[PDB]
Design an enzyme around this catalytic site. Sequence first.
Site, mmCIF file in Angstrom:
data_model
loop_
_atom_site.group_PDB
_atom_site.id
_atom_site.type_symbol
_atom_site.label_atom_id
_atom_site.label_comp_id
_atom_site.label_asym_id
_atom_site.label_seq_id
_atom_site.Cartn_x
_atom_site.Cartn_y
_atom_site.Cartn_z
ATOM 1 N N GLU A 60 13.567 2.795 0.457
ATOM 2 C CA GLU A 60 12.798 2.310 -0.722
ATOM 3 C C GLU A 60 11.558 3.163 -0.993
ATOM 4 O O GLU A 60 10.451 2.583 -0.883
ATOM 5 C CB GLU A 60 12.357 0.859 -0.524
ATOM 6 C CG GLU A 60 13.461 -0.062 -0.043
ATOM 7 C CD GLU A 60 13.024 -1.511 0.085
ATOM 8 O OE1 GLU A 60 13.677 -2.259 0.837
ATOM 9 O OE2 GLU A 60 12.028 -1.883 -0.566
ATOM 10 N N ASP A 61 11.721 4.465 -1.281
ATOM 11 C CA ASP A 61 10.578 5.277 -1.702
ATOM 12 C C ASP A 61 9.501 5.365 -0.616
ATOM 13 O O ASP A 61 8.375 4.912 -0.790
ATOM 14 C CB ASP A 61 9.983 4.740 -3.006
ATOM 15 C CG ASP A 61 10.903 4.935 -4.185
ATOM 16 O OD1 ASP A 61 11.684 5.907 -4.175
ATOM 17 O OD2 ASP A 61 10.846 4.120 -5.127
ATOM 18 N N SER A 62 9.870 5.959 0.511
ATOM 19 C CA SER A 62 8.887 6.292 1.536
ATOM 20 C C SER A 62 9.186 7.671 2.094
ATOM 21 O O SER A 62 10.200 8.272 1.735
ATOM 22 C CB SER A 62 8.882 5.254 2.652
ATOM 23 O OG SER A 62 8.448 4.004 2.165
#
Lengths: 39, 44, 477, 257, 528, 64, 49, 117, 48
Positions: C155-157
């Site tokens: 998730e977008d890390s």
Amino acid sequence: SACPLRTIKRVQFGVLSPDELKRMSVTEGGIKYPETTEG
Amino acid sequence: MIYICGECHTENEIKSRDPIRCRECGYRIMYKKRTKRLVVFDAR
Amino acid sequence: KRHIDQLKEREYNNYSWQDLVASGVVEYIDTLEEETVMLAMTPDDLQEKEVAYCSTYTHCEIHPSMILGVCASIIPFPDHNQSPRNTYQSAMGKQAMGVYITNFHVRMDTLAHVLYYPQKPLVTTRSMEYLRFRELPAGINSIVAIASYTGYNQEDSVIMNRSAVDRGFFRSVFYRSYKEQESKKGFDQEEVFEKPTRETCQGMRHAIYDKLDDDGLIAPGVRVSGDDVIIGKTVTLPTKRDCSTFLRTSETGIVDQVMVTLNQEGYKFCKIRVRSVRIPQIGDKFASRHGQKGTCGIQYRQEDMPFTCEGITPDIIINPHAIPSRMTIGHLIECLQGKVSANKGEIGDATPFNDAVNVQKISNLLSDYGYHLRGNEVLYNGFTGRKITSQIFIGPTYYQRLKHMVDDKIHSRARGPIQILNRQPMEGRSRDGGLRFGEMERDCQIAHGAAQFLRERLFEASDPYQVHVCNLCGIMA
Amino acid sequence: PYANQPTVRITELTDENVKFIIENTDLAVANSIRRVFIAEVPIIAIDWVQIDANSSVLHDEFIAHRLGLIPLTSDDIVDKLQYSRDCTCEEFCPECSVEFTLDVRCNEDQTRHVTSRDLISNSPRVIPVTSDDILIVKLRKGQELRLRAYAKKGFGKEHAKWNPTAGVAFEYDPDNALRHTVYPKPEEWPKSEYSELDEDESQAPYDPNGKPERFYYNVESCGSLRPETIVLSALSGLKKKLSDLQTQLSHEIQSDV
Amino acid sequence: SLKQRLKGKEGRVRGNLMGKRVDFSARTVITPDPNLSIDQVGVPRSIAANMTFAEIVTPFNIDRLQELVRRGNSQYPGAKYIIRDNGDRIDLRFHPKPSDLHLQTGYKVERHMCDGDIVIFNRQPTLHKMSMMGHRVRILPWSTFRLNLSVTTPYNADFDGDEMNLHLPQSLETRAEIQELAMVPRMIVTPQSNRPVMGIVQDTLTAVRKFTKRDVFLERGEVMNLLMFLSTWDGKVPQPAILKPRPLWTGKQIFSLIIPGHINCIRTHSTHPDDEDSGPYKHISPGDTKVVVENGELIMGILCKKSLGTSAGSLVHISYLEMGHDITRLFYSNIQTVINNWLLIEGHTIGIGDSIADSKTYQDIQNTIKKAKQDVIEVIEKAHNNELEPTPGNTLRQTFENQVNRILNDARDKTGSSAQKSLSEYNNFKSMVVSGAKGSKINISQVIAVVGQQNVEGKRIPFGFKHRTLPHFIKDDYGPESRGFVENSYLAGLTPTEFFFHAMGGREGLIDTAVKTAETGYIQRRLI
Amino acid sequence: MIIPVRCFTCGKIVGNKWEAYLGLLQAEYTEGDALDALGLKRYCCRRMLLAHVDLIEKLLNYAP
Amino acid sequence: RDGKLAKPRQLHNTLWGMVCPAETPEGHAVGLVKNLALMAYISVGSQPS
Amino acid sequence: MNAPPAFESFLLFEGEKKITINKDTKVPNACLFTINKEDHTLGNIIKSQLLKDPQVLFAGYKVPHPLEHKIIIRVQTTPDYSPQEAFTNAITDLISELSLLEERFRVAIKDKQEGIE
Amino acid sequence: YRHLALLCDTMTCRGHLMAITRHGVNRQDTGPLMKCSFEETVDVLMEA
Ligand SMILES: [Mg+2]
Ligand SMILES: [Zn+2]
Ligand SMILES: [Zn+2]
Ligand SMILES: [Zn+2]
Ligand SMILES: [Zn+2]
């Protein structure tokens, strides 16, 4: 502190008469001077 | 204490409650001199 | 051609743009006039006699890449991304830390960020030589791998190398200035910089007033922490009632320099700058040049990152799921083009409508660079040394460090100072007040059926009180 | 139910790297000594700076940081130095520290480079690696710098300034004889440096009853320790960890009664 | 005036009577943590050493509490107030000598927030009652809130600079109520649509699909290492499916240990050919479809979003209906931990080798587009020579645009199917699309084959310039490329005129979302 | 602002190679050949010098 | 800054070459503030005499 | 200061003890060791050695949280053997392996004092 | 279904179509202290 504790069950509205207004007020005779403090 | 002019960098002791101006330069921006109590760092 | 071979000589010929307009080869064209005109986009391709579209062309464009603004002409290959992506980055490269001006030593600005080691891109657009992006750059070329490693980059890390942060990677500094001005608000009420003493002055708190000098200011060089006093200013009472200025909470700065001078109306005033170093940690926000923002999930040492067959560990690892939904294929070519530029020694070219490099041409070069043309490579696992069944796409890219750090967004309240008139929780000197319990939160709790928790949050956790009430009448007593 | 007989064989030896090969061992042991070259080899480095006068362009905490990453010669006297938290002295003493000193002033008009040739120590055994010069700061006419620093002892789990090695290569099974990794198209992949395949082959044939052996290493060095004493000090350091844990264990199952 | 003192919002009737500002609350960023149960939350030590909880002194906890009061405001697990029976609130970060303080039955110590406490956790906009569930505290080193991933679906959260608040019940009645009412394992199925709200998510889903394929065999060491992570394991090792050269276990054989109790279920995988129930092999399924969970063990089938995600009749739904609310928690946690610790052996990635195709595909896509352009030219020229006949209720220009839309859509779809058709089993796009973790079938074709046709306001790109779209086309050009048909792929890049039309489509798609939030919030507030 | 003393990824010492790098580009060398004459063979250690902007030479223009 | 009318917010074609098509902020000010392209030049005025 | 100092990762506190034994009650002849201030470097070196013993049924290890410093090891042996026996017999076999490899190495570097070629 | 049924039942309960609006809520047999929470506190409370 010595008194108990209790709920509220009904709120009644109404206008209050000048009678109790004068009877329960705290500054007897009335506020007369527009200046708050003097010294 | 001791102040440093902002143009000529000539230190001059300014006494308490005294106008803020340099000497030999006539300037009005003063920087306080660095302290003399020592602080230690880590290379980390 | 006579105009070109004498225009590449402006340095010692005095022939420039003005002598080009005055010779009738270019012309300014308004918007209204632009409806009575017939444009060609490119000479060598639209002005050839054939079975042709038109034959009465009246003007021609210089280069179709001049239809982009300032913040949108630093994107490499934007003609390959989905459209909303180019809008995000142009509103996101405006908050990337770098060096903002060369004389940042003199300016006592508030809230100035400065990077240690800025670098210029390895894949540049040709319209960046004119806005000075190779003399005041903001970013660092990092080696990025697109793989799923341990689940901490979902998730977008991003996972990032810990023993590269220890060598200066994306380290920066942070300045901040404070003003104080002594003032004579009344004939007798007068302020002055001095060191407040305990028995004379009265409205002091419990601070350590030893760091202050005789003047009332801190000499530069000391290490001022949270809740220290920096400026001692006493007001005379109609004895002496002192004020002062304290830091915010959790600064841990070092006093940079102190300035003393006279402002406009002639009152003495001083300015103080506080220096603080910021090392990247696991809340900070990093973003690419194609609209991929993301925080940092965890930091592994070099002995744990996956390596190649010659010991090249990536600095950043990002999730492969970020690509297929938003379709930023310009992000996948600048890391293929970038790998050719580091092996050959040139600096690449990513002008949008030039579109000079085919991905395959670049891809083939990478195998030629002994780094598989697929941009793919064989990585080994860092924990067990085994090979990874898939081949990972790895290459150098240009990342930026946004301004939103985590040291600035954490706060907590537990029985703090309250107000005076309404006795509702109020902010205090520790920056930390309460969070509002709005209307929509009052309804999730009603649907839950939690009647005690709904009472605690609104009455027991906010201004409790008791009164006395008469029994026969319903008036306070 | 017992150990193995590993055999070492060195291929190269320079003053900055070693190439060797460890046959007949297990993968977990060949990796646990790859993480010790990095983390747990002790070394000397600066860890305490105090600045008396800094009128340069970089602020005080910039210079205090570019100093710690300077590598000091830690060849022989690392075994005689205590950890400053174990030593029975005060904050500092010549039994657990080494004191440096820098003092530079620029007077000519031409700019001045403040290299690492200015770090002057008291012990002639620990000096920066000069026997070019690392740059620390440049000064202009009228600026100066002077400080005092101590250099402690530690390893690479504290801070990345205490690890003694540059990149440490490592790899095994140069051809997918075990198929630990799976290529989709095995023809596009370059052949490894250590491979023994023909020029027209891609992978060795699969053999199921295999096991990883013959690991290949390549250890470089930053300049503090010789590249062959980085290895000898690692094996002698890992052995002393297990040997100390066995004490605590037998002390537990003895006090079980 | 007095009537002016009690106005509407921010007066005294609508700004301080029902909506106010409370204490015992904190706020910071959130970051993932797969090692936490779905009912726990991670709290930093600077927040936990600030918020308190009043604990009455009873002869059952007198010694522990006086020990806590020995150490105050300096050690972390301490206390910072003593409230005796008289109401006297003394402060102990200062009392000169702490040892004189002797706690007594009836007193009330103000403890520091320790592990095991109960809190309430919500996100910025609270829409449904699942946006405020009761968690349980577990204290960790650094300074962000840490929470599991399967709970991000109810909160609608994501870890790119988000923030969430927590409130701490001070009363024991309030704490008890939340414990037996709004704890997160009690709100798995929602009354809005009678189906689960929490399911397995993106990462673990892609791996669960690969872990339960027909050919996944594990050795002995790996099986032991995986069993080490089961919290509900009885202690027995099952007999392998293949007992000769080496004992090899299977994926489904290990997954059968995670499934709780003895439940029963029958689903299908997202690639089940509809013509399989017709012929033979109905109960054999060459493709290994038709999930069958009989007596609590996976007999056959691959697991995906249709069988583990938040939907009606899923595996989690049945496990909640039959076993209860305290076993489904362990189900979630075990699935996540085991599958992650196998995924770091199997690995997963995405590159550009997974975004490229064979030459034939390139050759064929070009041909279909050239034919599509030919048809549009025929229709336009035929309309000029006035050979088109409008259909009932259509003008000639509307019906000409109907012919044009028809052709364009059909062309795009046929190309998209061709692009879909050329993929491999090792492709990493197909691996996230099939398992349902992230993506759709359209993105594959847009990356590989054709971006398609843009349109603003639900119609083709309008003649913004007088009888033109750009000053580079000729006048009244009705072709496909001159009015928005992007015929490249995101891998081959777009030409300038296509990059502009794409920007237009994206812009309108970006404005609609900005409007929607305010509209829906206001209407819901009114209705409620 | 000033050349880092260590590559962020490997750890190899780079801070002593900036003046020699300018000296090789001074005569006729290409950036690809100057980096090979110094012994930088991993593409993580070549990024260090290839993409470095030297801001310290512009802060020495302001009189102290 | 809050009117829901789209026609003053959508991208006009006449903006070709004079206002950047991609650069604009999100939120409530979408399409209300705009940046001008690289070679766009604004006139200063003169006398029609 | 909300960040731990770096020495907390390997330096033992005063009350802590490095190793702790507990017997698993679910199956016979099982044990569960809990080493403190340790990581994968030591955890993995042990497990691989226990599997080489033909009298060990189970062996594994886990770091329960990467942000704390503690590992756990579980062992199960045949009914005529002791988990505490199998554990200490593993260690003395590592030490007998490292000290041997050090001798063979120190010989190889002085095998080219001047050079073999 | 229960949610649709309950909504469309409480919306048409008093016989006529009262919209969920400002002056649709303004009219029912409700107390005085609820209509004071909606923008006409003082006048309706003076009436009361
Ligand atoms: Mg978000
Ligand atoms: Zn002066
Ligand atoms: Zn009464
Ligand atoms: Zn000492
Ligand atoms: Zn390197």
